[PDB]
Amino acid sequence: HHWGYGKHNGPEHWHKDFPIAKGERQSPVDIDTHTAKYDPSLKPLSVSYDQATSLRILNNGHAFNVEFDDSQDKAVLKGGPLDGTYRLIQFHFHWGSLDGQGSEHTVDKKKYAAELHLVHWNTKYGDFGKAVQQPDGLAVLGIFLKVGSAKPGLQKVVDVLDSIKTKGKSADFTNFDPRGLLPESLDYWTYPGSLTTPPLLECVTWIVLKEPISVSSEQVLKFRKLNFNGEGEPEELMVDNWRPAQPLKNRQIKASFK
Ligand SMILES: CNc1c(F)c(S(N)(=O)=O)c(F)c(F)c1S(=O)(=O)CCc1ccccc1
Numbered sequence: 001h002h003w004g005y006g007k008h009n010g011p012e013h014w015h016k017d018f019p020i021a022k023g024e025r026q027s028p029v030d031i032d033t034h035t036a037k038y039d040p041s042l043k044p045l046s047v048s049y050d051q052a053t054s055l056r057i058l059n060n061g062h063a064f065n066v067e068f069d070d071s072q073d074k075a076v077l078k079g080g081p082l083d084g085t086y087r088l089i090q091f092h093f094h095w096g097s098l099d100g101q102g103s104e105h106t107v108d109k110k111k112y113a114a115e116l117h118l119v120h121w122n123t124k125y126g127d128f129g130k131a132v133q134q135p136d137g138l139a140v141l142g143i144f145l146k147v148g149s150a151k152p153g154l155q156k157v158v159d160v161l162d163s164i165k166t167k168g169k170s171a172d173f174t175n176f177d178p179r180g181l182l183p184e185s186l187d188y189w190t191y192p193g194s195l196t197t198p199p200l201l202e203c204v205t206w207i208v209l210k211e212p213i214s215v216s217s218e219q220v221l222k223f224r225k226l227n228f229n230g231e232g233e234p235e236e237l238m239v240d241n242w243r244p245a246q247p248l249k250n251r252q253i254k255a256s257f258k
């Protein structure tokens with residue numbers, strides 16, 4: 001009876017195994033755009049993905065993960081609100097059963113169809129597993145997806161999904177360039193928060209871009225053909241793998257713009 005994205009094992013149950021679920025800096029949150037504070041001290045985000053080296057794509061049972069070789073100083077996130085250098089380790093998405101839901105963060109209560117998480121760890125902690133044990137261990141760049149025109153830089157991911165349909169499947173995934181997933185603007189909101197799945201560790205500086213990317217209905221439809229189950233088990237479509245917004249408690253969301 002492990003955690004997941006259903007009635008008896010979904011987000012409202014996670015606190016029994018992971019009591020930090022009711023902690024002081026949980027994610028996601030609703031972003032109140034009127035209450036977010038413009039912070040003229042915030043720097044432009046520096047996203048340096050030119051040398052990123054993707055390796056593989058994996059269905060981990062609740063998302064698909066595009067993994068990068070993070071053993072050199074390649075794909076890094078810096079600036080913005082961050083004090084160090086954070087290295088890209090992987091990206092994944094959260095999405096809905098319907099276009100009207102799927103994002104984890106919300107913007108004035110608006111839910112997007114999906115949300116992309118580009119996950120980076122602080123190089124001062126040496127590796128990802130040590131970083132998640134620190135309050136400044138991770139920087140996650142969150143990007144909303146809306147349904148409209150296709151995202152061409154997404155299609156290589158979409159097309160490999162039929163090869164990783166079920167939990168535990170992987171496929172080689174080299175030469176994927178994550179710059180194809182970024183909107184034109186790097187304007188953002190930022191706040192201190194957590195992993196949005198168990199173990200829910202309070203280790204994340206969230207950086208959420210204001211500008212969504214467009215993907216086509218056919219692209220998100222292929223996300224929804226994935227399965228939470230393993231091969232040879234009853235089929236459970238991988239949909240609604242998002243945590244709802246959590247209490248903001250004693251936090252301020254800062255805006256890089258306006
Ligand atoms: C990639 N690591 C990761 C993560 F990025 C996030 S999120 N949604 O970005 O805060 C999580 F919520 C999260 F829980 C993890 S995990 O590696 O500890 C547990 C395994 C896992 C892997 C992929 C997606 C979610 C959780």
Ligand SMILES: [Zn+2]
Nearest residue numbers: 092094117196
């Ligand atoms: Zn995520």
